[PDB]
Design a binder for these strands. Structure first.
Ligand SMILES: [Mg+2]
Ligand SMILES: [Mg+2]
Ligand SMILES: [Mg+2]
Ligand SMILES: [Mg+2]
Ligand SMILES: [Mg+2]
Ligand SMILES: [Mg+2]
Ligand SMILES: [Mg+2]
Ligand SMILES: [Mg+2]
Ligand SMILES: [Mg+2]
Ligand SMILES: [Mg+2]
Ligand SMILES: [Mg+2]
Ligand SMILES: [Mg+2]
Ligand SMILES: [Mg+2]
Ligand SMILES: [Mg+2]
Ligand SMILES: [Mg+2]
Ligand SMILES: [Mg+2]
Ligand SMILES: [Mg+2]
Ligand SMILES: [Mg+2]
Ligand SMILES: [Mg+2]
Ligand SMILES: [Mg+2]
Ligand SMILES: [Mg+2]
Ligand SMILES: [Mg+2]
Ligand SMILES: [Mg+2]
Ligand SMILES: [Mg+2]
Ligand SMILES: [Mg+2]
Ligand SMILES: [Mg+2]
Ligand SMILES: [Mg+2]
Ligand SMILES: [Mg+2]
Ligand SMILES: [Mg+2]
Ligand SMILES: [Mg+2]
Ligand SMILES: [Mg+2]
Ligand SMILES: [Mg+2]
Ligand SMILES: [Mg+2]
Ligand SMILES: [Mg+2]
Ligand SMILES: [Mg+2]
Ligand SMILES: [Mg+2]
Ligand SMILES: [Mg+2]
Ligand SMILES: [Mg+2]
Ligand SMILES: [Mg+2]
Ligand SMILES: [Mg+2]
Ligand SMILES: [Mg+2]
Ligand SMILES: [Mg+2]
Ligand SMILES: [Mg+2]
Ligand SMILES: [Mg+2]
Ligand SMILES: [Mg+2]
Ligand SMILES: [Mg+2]
Ligand SMILES: [Mg+2]
Ligand SMILES: [Mg+2]
Ligand SMILES: [Mg+2]
Ligand SMILES: [Mg+2]
Ligand SMILES: [Mg+2]
Ligand SMILES: [Mg+2]
Lengths: 122, 56, 7, 114, 120, 209
RNA sequence: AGGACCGAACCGACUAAUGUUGAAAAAUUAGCGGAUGACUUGUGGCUGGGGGUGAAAGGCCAAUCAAACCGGGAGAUAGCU
RNA sequence: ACACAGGUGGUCAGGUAGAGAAUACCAAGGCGCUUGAGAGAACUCGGGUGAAGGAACUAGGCAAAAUGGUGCCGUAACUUC
RNA sequence: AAUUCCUUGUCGGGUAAGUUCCGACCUGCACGAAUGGCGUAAUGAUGGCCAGGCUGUCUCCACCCGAGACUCAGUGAAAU
RNA sequence: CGAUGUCGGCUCAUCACAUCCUGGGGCUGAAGUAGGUCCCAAGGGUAUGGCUGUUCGCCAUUUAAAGUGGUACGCGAGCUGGGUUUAGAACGUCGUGAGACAGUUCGGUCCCUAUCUGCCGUGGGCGCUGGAGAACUGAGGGGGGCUGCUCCUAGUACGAGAGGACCGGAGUGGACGCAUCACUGGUGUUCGGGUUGUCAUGCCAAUGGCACUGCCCGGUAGCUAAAUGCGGAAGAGAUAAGUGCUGAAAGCAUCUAAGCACGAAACUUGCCCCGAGAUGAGUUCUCCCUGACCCUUUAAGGGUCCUGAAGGAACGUUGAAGACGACGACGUUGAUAGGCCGGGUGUGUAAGCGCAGCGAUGCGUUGAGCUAACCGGUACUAAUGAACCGUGAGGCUUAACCU
């Protein structure tokens, strides 16, 4: 349940630390990104010699949220914070090379298979 | 907001087309004391359906 | 006298 | 409602082991890993139990790689293969929502032992 | 918007209601019959009967509880000593309402509510 | 084909072998009993009229009782018609069980939606609310403006205004039939249907593909 | 020690909502400034209308003030309605 | 103008908690405010709580929410010290 | 610039994006020395701008407790 | 000019079409993809932000698209009041000055209880020709009508290659709408618990009042969205621009003059809601009523006596129905409400007693005690026969049957 102004943590060695969502892509007037949706972020904080610098504007798939994800049986997977994985604009696809923290199977998404193949859990 | 013209006496009449009261038609008489009383209510001398309930 | 009615 | 009970309980599990909030359970859950169905383990502290017949459920909180992961199981879904009590917890409170505001060391709950 | 909700609000706030019915279950119990508006009278049955019920089992717990509700030992004495054993064998309906017309000064629907045996 | 009249029992769920929870509405469908057939010759259209359930005899009226008596079925809580369809054919007194649906696959389900009473514009029409703050005076939930100026100089018919919402006829289309069990008078359809538990439902095989 | 600090009384009157045929011809509620000083208050006194008084706004001078109120000149005059 | 939520100087200062004449609860004393009875729609007023988000509101963070004590530790630029 | 018409001047900073803000330039339409010029610690219910927290301000509204609104009785207005 | 308040915002919209997107089509300096231009088309759809009062504009980032206009430059007895905005003040500029600016700047009162029209809802009345209870037919009315992406066809047609389709099919989304409470959650001042200050019930223990529900932690029923189900359609008819067949007038040609085939989100249908006050008051099924008398200007006349059905309504108990009316359930041959029993649920191990400890407190009895609107039961309490309203066989004419 991410939206404009929402701050998110980064879940990779992209160098970004705190990104803010400035757009929920995928539909006119569309108000939330979640589950494993693709938002557009600016960068509010990055480490000193990362692959992205602060102020940079690119995209990112959301991979962990407080609102979480339901399953065909009714149950819910919740997360303590909101996390995304930076992708680059004219390619989606992840800038980083490692992934941190758990991710959910919803990412099965062909193009995000990399993200699952890395990444510790679920 | 107030009226632009004085309403007519006729109109007053029509507006009150519905405030007639309805008399009751529902009194009954206690079989054991013969005082009138509304249905499902007790009587003045405290009778209800024949037995003397209450007692004040 | 003070703009809008009646400020 | 008498019909609905008929429908519901003929769908209920008759072996849900006992556990209470505080207990540490390991839930074994069926999942399709790529091309494989396979049991998978989720273990953590029971912070809440929703007691309602077929709809009964429980929230199990676990700290995965740095932060919390709560997941609410639906006790009677086929997805839930088995439930297990790794450690009986001692708390007094039905809903343990306060553990969220606690990290690592504060998070610990006394063992019930008895 | 009320769907399936119980409980009359009697144009009062929560505490006040509770106060009043405490003050009124005691009345009914003491006098075994009182006169009140029909609405209150009907609510009263919800407060007063379960006291009676409670009283059908004399213990310390139960008296203390009947003191928690009511907060008057004369009354918690009567339940238990008289009333509980009176209604020992009757499954509820300890109380009964008799509609009795209309209040002069405001036209409120009145009723009597009484213990089912009085004699007093 | 025709449809039956039932009762809304409540909702629950059917867990499926492969770990899906299907949300279902539990609809009672006691045998419907045909109280009248109608045809061209006699009515100018073909249809069955049916009853179901039962009615306290005291609360059955002389007229009602007459009409029932004729068809030789016992009273039921009401009457409902179903348009016959060139082919369909029934006879007075015939009994129709929920198994009418032992396939169909999807059904349309009509009921009387729960009653919200006098709804305002926000709830009734999703009218978006004015400022809570920033100067607004007594005008948060109120409906805004309701017209232009001299031109119309009136308000247009069908204007979204506040009023009764709920408690009206609503159909919900193409719900998957989940189960049909006549021995138990059960129809399980997937999804919520109109009306509070207890009230009447009309299940017709879904009209849309 | 201090036209010192925080804060009740007391003096004030920055924001908002309410009220706007008000509970009130200026207030109520929640917040707000001063609060040993150029502080604040009771009683009585003095200044009078082209006059007073004014840490000055044309402020205040009995619900008012770019000239108070009352009575008079007086039926001012009104090429206007 | 009212049996008016306004205005009006001085005197008295109990118990527990508290720095206190603040505040909460009490004592003495005084009161429930001169239409009530029911309903538990919209909308208004006055409050409580709120998933995820967190100023994206708006002229403006207006309004809310937040902060809030005591004692220790410890506090930058700048400075008329 | 409480002063600049042209004007959102230009450049730099901050922002994903800044007609405002800040630092700069000088082409001051139309600054300037007790009609005081320029600075200035502290003070300010003073104007503009940023940020942390905070939040129903907002996405987008839900529920709830109360006073009206609604119903019965008594009294009983108003502007026009 | 004895008062027609205003820029922008908010809210709510409603039309036009010179159409922004989506649909159809002609030409193209149209290979494909993608464009250009024009014709047809108004069904639906048609962005959030940074700055500024702005509208606009620029900029950032979306989108299929971010249409242009009318509506007192729509919308202040609907809100706002930043712009405009009297009185205070200041700068610059003008003026000897009072002052002034169509320059700038800081501050700065937005009243109105709705009679009528209109609109949204909801009742009362009468009518529909004896009265009544139902189920209908369906004239008319309203709603709805959006669209991304991916996959197949197909890496095919096309193309030197890059790239890359038409036609058709399949999925899954965005925004919107409706329903619902099963799930996930919110709330839950009527449930349970912890806790501060103080007062009380003599004291202890145990409780209760007040302090925002004192402050909090949870939470039932209900309500509810963020929650989960469903929708937009397909199909059909007649068309728009347009493409044509046959074909003369005009030996040829010609979509047209006669005749014939096609052709779009527009239209009529198909879908959903209302709907016989459709006074053109319709249809079908059922139910109930089978006394006489007087008078007058003697007629669809007026009255009286007796009668009083079907049904309605009343009263009571009530409801996921509700402002009030209304609608639904039930009234003893009874589960309608309250209570009561059992269960559930929530809270989370009461009181009391015992043991341990100097004590705070712990442990045992104990998953205890308590537990709302919930489920399953139960006549204990309350739902008294009655009253009222509604009548007593139902006009004339013609026709068709009928004696
Ligand atoms: Mg109920
Ligand atoms: Mg009242
Ligand atoms: Mg309702
Ligand atoms: Mg809004
Ligand atoms: Mg106001
Ligand atoms: Mg307000
Ligand atoms: Mg001082
Ligand atoms: Mg104040
Ligand atoms: Mg001070
Ligand atoms: Mg004096
Ligand atoms: Mg004065
Ligand atoms: Mg003069
Ligand atoms: Mg004079
Ligand atoms: Mg003279
Ligand atoms: Mg004169
Ligand atoms: Mg008084
Ligand atoms: Mg007074
Ligand atoms: Mg005090
Ligand atoms: Mg009183
Ligand atoms: Mg709050
Ligand atoms: Mg929130
Ligand atoms: Mg939160
Ligand atoms: Mg934050
Ligand atoms: Mg904005
Ligand atoms: Mg903004
Ligand atoms: Mg503020
Ligand atoms: Mg606050
Ligand atoms: Mg500067
Ligand atoms: Mg900003
Ligand atoms: Mg100067
Ligand atoms: Mg000089
Ligand atoms: Mg100076
Ligand atoms: Mg000062
Ligand atoms: Mg309320
Ligand atoms: Mg009245
Ligand atoms: Mg006029
Ligand atoms: Mg006027
Ligand atoms: Mg056109
Ligand atoms: Mg051209
Ligand atoms: Mg205009
Ligand atoms: Mg106004
Ligand atoms: Mg201005
Ligand atoms: Mg109004
Ligand atoms: Mg709930
Ligand atoms: Mg004690
Ligand atoms: Mg008290
Ligand atoms: Mg209280
Ligand atoms: Mg030819
Ligand atoms: Mg219909
Ligand atoms: Mg129980
Ligand atoms: Mg029950
Ligand atoms: Mg007769």
């Amino acid at each position: 349940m991410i939206q404009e102004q929402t701050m998110l943590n980064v879940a990779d060695n992209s160098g970004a630390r705190r990104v803010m969502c400035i757009k929920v892509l995928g539909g006119s007037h569309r108000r939330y990104a979640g589950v494993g949706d693709i938002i557009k972020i600016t960068i509010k904080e990055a480490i000193p010699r990362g692959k992205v610098k602060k102020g940079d504007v690119l995209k990112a798939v959301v991979v962990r949220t407080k609102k979480g994800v339901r399953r065909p049986d009714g149950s819910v997977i919740r997360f303590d914070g909101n996390a995304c994985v930076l992708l680059n604009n004219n390619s989606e696809q992840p800038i980083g090379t490692r992934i941190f923290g758990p991710v959910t199977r919803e990412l099965r998404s062909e193009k995000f298979m990399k993200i699952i193949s890395l990444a510790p859990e679920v | 907001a107030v009226q632009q013209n004085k309403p007519t006496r006729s109109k007053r009449g029509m507006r009150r087309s519905h405030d007639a009261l309805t008399a009751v038609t529902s009194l009954s008489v206690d079989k054991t004391s013969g005082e009138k009383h509304l249905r499902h209510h007790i009587t003045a001398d405290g009778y209800y359906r024949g037995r003397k309930v209450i007692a004040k | 006298x003070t703009x809008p009615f009646x400020x | 409602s008498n019909i609905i009970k008929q429908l519901e309980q003929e769908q209920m599990k008759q072996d849900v082991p006992s556990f209470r909030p505080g207990d540490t359970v390991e839930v074994k859950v069926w999942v399709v890993e790529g091309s494989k169905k396979r049991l998978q383990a989720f273990e953590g502290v029971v912070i809440a139990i929703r007691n309602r017949g077929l709809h009964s459920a429980f929230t199990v909180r676990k700290i995965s790689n740095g932060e919390g992961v709560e997941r609410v199981f639906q006790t009677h879904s086929p997805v839930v293969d088995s439930i297990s009590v790794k450690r009986r917890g001692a708390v007094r409170k039905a809903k343990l929502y306060y553990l969220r505001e606690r990290t690592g060391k504060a998070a610990r709950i006394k063992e019930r032992l008895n | 918007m009320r769907h399936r909700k119980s409980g009359r609000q009697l144009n009062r706030n929560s505490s006040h209601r509770q106060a009043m019915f405490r003050n009124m279950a005691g009345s009914l119990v003491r006098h075994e019959i009182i006169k009140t508006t029909l609405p209150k009278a009907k609510e009263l049955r919800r407060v007063v009967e379960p006291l009676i019920t409670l009283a059908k089992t004399d213990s310390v717990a139960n008296r203390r509880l009947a003191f928690a509700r009511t907060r008057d030992n004369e009354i918690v004495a009567k339940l238990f000593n008289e009333l509980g054993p009176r209604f020992a064998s009757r499954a509820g309906g300890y109380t009964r309402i008799l509609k009795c017309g209309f209040r002069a000064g405001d036209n409120a629907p009145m009723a009597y509510i009484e213990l089912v045996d009085r004699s007093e | 084909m025709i449809g039956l009249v039932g009762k809304k029992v409540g909702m629950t769920r059917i867990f499926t072998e492969d770990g899906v929870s299907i949300p279902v509405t539990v609809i009672e469908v006691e045998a419907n009993r045909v109280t009248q057939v109608k045809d061209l010759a006699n009515d100018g259209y073909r249809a069955i009229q049916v009853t179901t359930g039962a009615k306290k005899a005291n609360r059955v009226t002389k007229p009602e009782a007459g009409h029932f008596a004729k068809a030789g079925v016992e009273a039921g809580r009401g009457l409902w018609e179903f348009r016959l369809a060139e082919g369909e054919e029934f006879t007075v007194g015939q009994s129709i069980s929920v198994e009418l649906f032992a396939d169909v696959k999807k059904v349309d389900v009509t009921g009387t939606s729960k009653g919200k009473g006098f709804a305002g514009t926000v709830k009734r029409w999703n009218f978006r609310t004015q400022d809570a703050t920033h100067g607004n005076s007594l005008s948060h939930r109120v409906p805004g403006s309701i017209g232009q100026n001299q031109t119309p100089g009136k308000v247009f018919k069908g204007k979204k205004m506040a009023g009764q919402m709920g408690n009206e006829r609503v159909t919900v289309q193409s719900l998957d039939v989940v189960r049909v069990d006549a021995e138990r008078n059960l129809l399980l359809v997937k999804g919520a249907v109109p009306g509070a538990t207890g009230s009447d439902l009309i299940v017709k095989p879904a009209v849309k593909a």
